[PDB]
Design a binder for this molecule. Structure first.
Ligand SMILES: Cc1cc2nc3c(=O)[nH]c(=O)nc-3n(C[C@H](O)[C@H](O)[C@H](O)COP(=O)(O)O)c2cc1C
Ligand SMILES: NC(=O)c1cc(C(=O)O)cc(-c2ccc(-c3ccccc3)cc2)c1
Ligand SMILES: O=C(O)c1cc(=O)[nH]c(=O)[nH]1
Length: 361
């Protein structure tokens, strides 16, 4: 794949010809077809959420919102794949432009608004490769499905309930996405009272599925939570027995120092400016849950060091997206190779040993 060629020539030129969204669409197409340019060592293997992951680096929700490039993403080197956010009924999302590049900050701002083909379309798309996925999962390549809610929905809880019943049987884990900053009032569902009611219904629906079709349930949270919000989330998670957390979605904050001309566009900020804010949220949730709740770290990961910092902070797995938009497919292998080297360099027998290491030092 040659990391330098992509980061210095291919990607840059591409960004100079097409707009963010068009580039994304093209990316999904090429990926789905397997038109892509490192062997995983046992050190990168991780066992959590009732599954084995050959490596802890996954593709974050948002790149493959409709589940169209799952196989191509596995081919890219990801240890697990999570498909964007799916809503019960189809919806176009916000008007364009709704995605912006901040190259000077190695960041992105997006306000898609949950553009989704809907549960039915995604359901049939995953059913067409359900058994193939069964073998991939058994092989250490799990599939996650991220659930959202429609813009005009009145009963948010019912929207997620539907997602559980329709896609739950096809996923190794489900994600209750209540941290999207582009859907009015969605984040308010992170409140203790609302989250408890919401997760109680989700878990009940999940427990009603046949055993082999019973996925783990995780909640994806924002990086803009107050200390109180985090304490409440942790409490609800332990009270209901949530299987895990996905730490920090994009941020509505705008860290001082941003240079991008489009820094003041409305939307969620991703990439490097979000990295440490995300790592710190992971560190806090890990401690609040006594390290007993699996955490998938996401936010500004572009190197082995970025991944290990989140792992040491408490993440059992990590994900990336924005880095892919700047460095291209080669970034996946780069992250894995650097993570492996750093693990050895720091005396860790493997990823598992480093999980939460900072809390024990
Ligand atoms: C263009 C774009 C679309 C996204 N769409 C979703 C989504 O539908 N659901 C979700 O849970 N997160 C979504 N995210 C958030 C990512 O999954 C991730 O939480 C965040 O971008 C931080 O990781 P990164 O800095 O490596 O991109 C999106 C991010 C971007 C940049
Ligand atoms: N928002 C995005 O998802 C996004 C934004 C941009 C951008 O330039 O803004 C670029 C990409 C992108 C384009 C092509 C490839 C690719 C795939 C297979 C083989 C070679 C290259 C990967 C990522 C995605
Ligand atoms: O579809 C979107 O706008 C979206 C959803 C989400 O969870 N995060 C994000 O940054 N964008």
């Amino acid at each position: 794949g040659d990391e330098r060629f992509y980061a210095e020539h291919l990607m840059p030129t591409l960004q100079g010809l097409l707009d963010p969204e068009s580039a994304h669409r093209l990316a999904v197409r090429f990926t789905s077809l397997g038109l892509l340019p490192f062997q995983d060592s046992d050190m990168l293997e991780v066992r959590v959420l009732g599954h084995k992951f050959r490596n802890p680096v996954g593709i974050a929700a948002g790149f493959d919102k409709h589940g169209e490039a799952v196989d191509g993403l596995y081919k890219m080197g990801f240890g697990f794949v999570e498909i964007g956010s799916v809503t019960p009924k189809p919806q176009e999302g916000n008007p364009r432009p709704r995605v912006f590049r901040l190259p000077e900050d190695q960041a992105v701002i997006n306000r898609y608004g949950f553009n989704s083909h809907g549960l039915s379309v995604v359901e049939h798309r995953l059913r067409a490769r359900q058994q193939k996925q069964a073998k991939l999962t058994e092989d250490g390549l799990p599939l996650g499905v991220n659930l959202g809610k429609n813009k005009t929905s009145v009963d948010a809880a019912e929207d997620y309930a539907e997602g559980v019943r329709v896609l739950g049987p096809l996923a190794d884990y489900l994600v209750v996405n209540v941290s999207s900053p582009n859907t009015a009032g969605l984040r308010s569902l992170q409140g203790k009272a609302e989250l408890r009611r919401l997760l109680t219904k989700v878990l009940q629906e999940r427990d009603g599925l046949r055993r082999v079709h019973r996925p783990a349930v995780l909640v994806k949270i924002a990086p803009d939570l107050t200390s109180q919000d985090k304490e409440d989330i942790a409490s609800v998670v332990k009270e209901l027995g949530i299987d895990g957390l996905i730490v920090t979605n994009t941020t509505v904050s705008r860290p001082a120092g941003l240079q991008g001309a489009l820094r003041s566009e409305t939307g969620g900020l991703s990439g490097k400016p979000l990295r440490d804010l995300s790592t710190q949220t992971i560190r806090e949730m890990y401690a609040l849950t006594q390290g007993r709740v699996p955490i998938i770290g996401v936010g500004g990961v572009s190197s082995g060091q970025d991944a290990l910092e989140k792992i040491r902070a408490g993440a059992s797995l990590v994900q990336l997206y924005t880095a892919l938009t700047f460095w291209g497919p080669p970034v996946v292998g780069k992250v894995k190779r650097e993570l492996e080297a750093l693990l050895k360099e720091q005396g860790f027998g493997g990823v598992t040993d480093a999980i939460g290491a900072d809390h024990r030092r």
